[PDB]
Every structure is written in structure tokens, then in C-alpha cells.
């Protein structure tokens, strides 16, 4: 999830958008 | 060296900012 994915790991992004409502 | 990870409060802003309107849910762990 966004944790791993922004936190644990480093995220881009659209995928930091696809958390939006 | 600079840190690009998201955590917590900053991970928060971080939504605040690209979600804009759209708004978004968040839980975290602690």
C-alpha cells in the first residue's frame, strides 16, 4: 500500500495520485 | 544524503497537495 510503496520504498506520482479519492 | 521517502505527517501533506479537491482517506498504523 501507499506505506511501502512512499514511505518503505520511494513513489512516483501517479502512483501517489491512484491514493486519491 | 537527501531522503525521498513519505512518512507519516509528510506522507499526509504529500496527499493534501496531489489530491487536491479530490480529497483522500488515510489510516495510519501508529
Redesign the interface.
Known sequence: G??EQ??????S?YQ??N??? | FVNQHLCGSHLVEALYLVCGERGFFYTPKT
Open positions: 501507499i506505506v512512499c514511505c518503505t520504498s520511494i513513489c506520482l501517489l495520485e491514493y486519491c479519492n
